[PDB]
Amino acid sequence: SAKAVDYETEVVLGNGERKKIGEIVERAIEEAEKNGKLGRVDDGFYAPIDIEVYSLDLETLKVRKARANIAWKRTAPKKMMLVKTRGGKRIRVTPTHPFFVLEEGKVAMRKARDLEEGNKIATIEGLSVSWDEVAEILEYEPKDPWVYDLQVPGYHNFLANGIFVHAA
């Protein structure tokens, strides 16, 4: 099953205005369709990209610019989850998409469908990294039949919708 996010999740770029992940991915897919670099998996596609994102270092909690190098487009699952935090962040993800959760001094990863209210996830507040309690998780059936992801070597996350979203 796909670990991925909704089209409209807005990725913070290190060197321009923030952009919907669906736009980033579909442009990369369209170009790779024509130059022979398109990759195919049973439930979707990958294509090369070269963009600058912001990533959290989970050991030091520093935010660093980092490069993302693969764009992923996958069939949406039958159900999706809207995750809302107390600090105001909202994101729509697949049910198995993992989040960094800080629990009793350690960070572990937890699937969206396994999150409970009060679980603290990694976010930005203004310009500060913040561990932010989940407020509610709500299942919905998607209208958009595609979901999206990026690969970020080393870090496996990128800042989007004010959340450090786990990545390929």
Residue numbers in the entry: -2 to 165
From the paper:
Protein splicing is catalyzed by intervening protein sequences termed inteins. The cell division control protein 21 (Cdc21), belonging to the MCM (mini-chromosome maintenance) protein family, is one of the proteins invaded by several inteins.
Indeed, we could obtain diffracting crystals of a variant of the PabCDC21-1 intein carrying mutations at the N- and C-terminal catalytic residues (C1A, and N164A) together with three N- and one C-extein residue (Ser-Ala-Lys and Ala, respectively). A large distance of about 8 Å suggests an open conformation as it has been observed in most intein structures containing extein residues. PabCDC21-1 has an improved C2-symmetry interface with the loop regions at the C35 and N35 sites with hydrophobic residues L53, L58, and V60 for the N-terminal, and I121, L124, and V126 for the C-terminal subdomain (the C35 and N35 numbering for the split sites is based on the NpuDnaE intein as described in Aranko et al. (2014a) for convenience). The structure of the PabCDC21-1 intein revealed extensive hydrophobic interactions between the C2-symmetry-related N35 and C35 loops, increasing the subdomain interactions at the elevated temperature optimal for the growth of Pyrococcus abyssi.
